[PDB]
Amino acid sequence: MPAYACQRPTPLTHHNTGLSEALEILAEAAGFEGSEGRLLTFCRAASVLKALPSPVTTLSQLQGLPHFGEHSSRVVQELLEHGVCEEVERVRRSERYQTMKLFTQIFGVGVKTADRWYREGLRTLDDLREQPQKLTQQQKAGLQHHQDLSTPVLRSDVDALQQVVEEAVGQALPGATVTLTGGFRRGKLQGHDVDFLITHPKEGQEAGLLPRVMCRLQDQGLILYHQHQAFERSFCIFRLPQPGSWKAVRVDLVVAPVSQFPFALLGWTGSKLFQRELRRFSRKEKGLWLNSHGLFDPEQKTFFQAASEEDIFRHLGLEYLPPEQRNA
DNA sequence: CGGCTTACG
DNA sequence: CGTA
DNA sequence: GCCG
Numbered sequence: 001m002p003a004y005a006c007q008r009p010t011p012l013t014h015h016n017t018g019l020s021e022a023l024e025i026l027a028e029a030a031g032f033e034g035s036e037g038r039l040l041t042f043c044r045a046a047s048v049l050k051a052l053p054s055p056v057t058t059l060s061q062l063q064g065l066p067h068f069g070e071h072s073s074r075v076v077q078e079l080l081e082h083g084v085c086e087e088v089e090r091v092r093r094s095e096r097y098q099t100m101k102l103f104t105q106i107f108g109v110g111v112k113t114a115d116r117w118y119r120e121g122l123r124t125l126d127d128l129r130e131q132p133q134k135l136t137q138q139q140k141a142g143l144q145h146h147q148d149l150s151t152p153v154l155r156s157d158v159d160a161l162q163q164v165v166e167e168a169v170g171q172a173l174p175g176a177t178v179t180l181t182g183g184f185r186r187g188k189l190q191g192h193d194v195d196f197l198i199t200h201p202k203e204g205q206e207a208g209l210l211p212r213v214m215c216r217l218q219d220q221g222l223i224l225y226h227q228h229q230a231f232e233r234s235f236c237i238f239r240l241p242q243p244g245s246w247k248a249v250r251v252d253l254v255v256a257p258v259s260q261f262p263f264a265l266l267g268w269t270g271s272k273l274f275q276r277e278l279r280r281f282s283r284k285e286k287g288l289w290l291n292s293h294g295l296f297d298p299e300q301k302t303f304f305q306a307a308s309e310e311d312i313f314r315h316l317g318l319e320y321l322p323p324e325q326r327n328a
Numbered sequence: 329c330g331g332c333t334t335a336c337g
Numbered sequence: 338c339g340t341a
Numbered sequence: 342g343c344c345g
């Protein structure tokens with residue numbers, strides 16, 4: 001088992017679901033307390049279990065696995081022996097974890113904001129609604145739409161959304177394309193949002209595209225919120241039809257020049273941990289700097305041209321993983 | 329011990 | 338600060 | 342929290 005998540009296939013569904021869930025609770029709780037290193041180790045240990053070919057049934061099977069030390073091994077041991085881990089259950093029922101989880105779920109609220117509200121004594125969404133002076137416009141939108149945004153987006157929802165985005169994109173710039181990215185591209189059947197990547201085959205024609213797209217979607221009455229109600233990324237709330245009604249859905253739109261499209265597709269397809277691990281691998285093992293725009297050799301001071309995700313894995317000396325196997 | 333992904337709004 |  |  002390799003140490004980096006980008007060195008092994010990780011399928012969406014696997015054989016250690018309960019074990020990985022528990023470790024991810026501890027990861028999430030570590031992030032709520034600002035311990036990014038502990039969050040990373042618990043996420044990586046969870047991801048190792050997702051990559052295993054069969055269930056862990058005995059503690060000895062953790063021998064030699066990367067990112068399993070005393071703490072993660074004890075969590076697994078207790079789950080194997082008792083079906084519950086006391087530390088995990090204590091986190092689950094703690095007021096701090098439940099409130100930080102509730103608050104950071106709000107669109108526009110991160111750990112720092114949630115933690116300040118927590119320290120001020122706030123605990124529920126209604127507490128926030130009673131103090132609208134504490135809220136940015138973005139947070140007001142996230143709070144108002146919180147119930148709809150807590151409902152999973154379905155794969156059936158995605159196709160109808162892509163068609164309306166393509167229609168607006170086609171009027172904004174004929175020939176521009178829309179690619180589904182994010183978790184749905186990795187094979188997920190539900191999601192917290194829908195992620196799209198937009199480009200145009202003629203380099204440079206995509207400049208200034210996203211404002212044109214957003215103002216067309218807004219004129220059609222489809223945008224419940226966006227930040228610009230020049231930019232290349234838009235995190236918005238869409239109005240999506242339902243039976244006899246509609247529901248709010250988060251949609252992320254990103255524009256990239258076609259020269260950068262493989263890097264942007266790779267970055268925005270995720271998973272988040274897969275990309276962190278891939279960029280760490282690139283820098284630490286290959287001495288190359290990877291981001292959503294390109295791959296930089298800092299010694300030659302040169303960028304790698306890529307025509308495909310396959311190109312990028314080859315540049316990094318990694319076996320290619322299709323999106324479905326990037327579910328780290 | 330240092331390190332832990334990276335850039336745009 | 339937020340977002341991905 | 343774990344790796345190198």
Ligand SMILES: Nc1nc2c(ncn2[C@H]2C[C@H](O)[C@@H](COP(=O)(O)NP(=O)(O)OP(=O)(O)O)O2)c(=O)[nH]1
Nearest residue numbers: 182183190191192193267268269270271272275341
């Ligand atoms: N490098 C990097 N990439 C990131 C980061 N955050 C997001 N991405 C990339 C990788 C992500 O795949 C992509 C957008 O995915 P999401 O919508 O944030 N989540 P997903 O679609 O997996 O699941 P669901 O929506 O159902 O919760 O942006 C980050 O901090 N860093």
Ligand SMILES: [K+]
Nearest residue numbers: 104105106109
């Ligand atoms: K949030």
Ligand SMILES: [Mn+2]
Nearest residue numbers: 182183193195
């Ligand atoms: Mn997504």
Ligand SMILES: [Mn+2]
Nearest residue numbers: 182193195252
């Ligand atoms: Mn997204």
